[PDB]
Design a protein that fits this description.
Elements: H1 4-10
Region (Active core): 1-12
Protein name: Antibacterial peptide KR-20
């Protein structure tokens, strides 16, 4: 499960 999408998307 890749959670990187949650961070990369969390930022502006």
């Amino acid at each position: 499960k890749r959670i990187v999408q949650r961070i990369k998307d969390f930022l502006r």
